């Protein structure tokens, strides 16, 4: 059982990316209101073309990218993406509850502290 | 090569620069002056900015 804001997960995939934004938060609504010439087709063509590689078995091939500033839409559900942290691409499988989030939220850009305790 | 100078420069310190030395630090753009802090101080007299009080 999973729904985003009242619409079911099987209603998510059978729904265009325009109708998803119409119930998104204000940042997501604003970005794609002025999202003309954002060049979204180069990355998204490589995602559906990678889903045809795996017929029924395990997760598709990773599609590595630099666009950390790209909002996750329901058409991305099930794909795996390597998100550039600044030096390295990190594969992260797009879970259905990742909607409305930026890709940079899932690839940390720093190794945190480990203050002392060399061990 | 169509990516050579493609990043936009329309606001912020990357677009504007000094008209005497082309620096981005310490710019004075009051009354459309567009001269750095250090360059303006050397030729404030020629522009007509004197120091009274």
């Amino acid at each position: 059982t999973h729904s985003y804001r009242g619409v079911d997960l099987e209603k998510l995939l059978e729904m265009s990316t325009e109708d998803f934004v119409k119930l998104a938060p204000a940042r997501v609504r604003r970005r794609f209101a002025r999202g003309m010439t954002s060049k979204p087709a180069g990355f998204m063509k490589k995602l559906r073309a990678a889903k045809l590689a795996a017929p029924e078995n395990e997760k598709p091939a990773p599609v590595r990218t630099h666009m950390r500033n790209m909002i996750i839409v329901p058409e991305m559900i099930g794909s795996v993406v390597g998100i550039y942290n600044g030096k390295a691409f990190n594969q992260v499988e797009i879970r259905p509850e990742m909607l409305g989030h930026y890709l940079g939220e899932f690839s940390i850009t720093y190794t945190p502290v480990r203050h002392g305790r060399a061990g | 090569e169509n990516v050579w100078f493609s990043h936009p420069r329309r606001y912020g310190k990357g677009s504007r620069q000094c008209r005497v030395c082309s620096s981005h630090t310490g710019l004075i753009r009051k009354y459309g002056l567009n001269i750095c802090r250090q360059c303006f101080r050397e030729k404030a007299n020629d522009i007509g900015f004197n120091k009274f009080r």
Binding site: - | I28, K30, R37, F40, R41, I47, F49, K51, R53
Partner: protein, 101 residues
């Protein structure tokens, strides 16, 4: 005759007041109603740079000033004498514009 207006703007007091004096002197050489020089408030243009290049030292500040003095005289004259009086009193440092109506 026609209603005219002459506006004077400069950064030099001594070079501006005598130009307006020549304007009014030519105005009652051949008499016509003056609406004489109405001095606008002087504008002080302040630029406050720090003092230096690099920030070493006591944080000392300078201020530089340019002073803009502005004067307008509202005359009326026949069309002939307008051009000559607008062309004789031309002096460096003083910017003169003449509004037709």
């Amino acid at each position: 005759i026609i209603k005219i207006r002459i506006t004077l703007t400069s950064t030099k007091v001594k070079q501006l007041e005598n130009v307006s004096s020549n304007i009014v002197k030519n105005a009652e050489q051949h008499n016509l109603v003056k609406k004489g020089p109405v001095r606008l408030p002087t504008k002080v243009l302040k630029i406050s740079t720090r003092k230096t290049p690099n920030g070493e030292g006591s944080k000392t500040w300078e201020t530089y000033e340019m002073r803009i003095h502005k004067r307008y005289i509202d005359l009326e004259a026949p069309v002939q004498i307008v051009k000559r009086i607008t062309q004789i009193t031309i002096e460096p440092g003083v910017d003169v514009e003449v509004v037709v109506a």
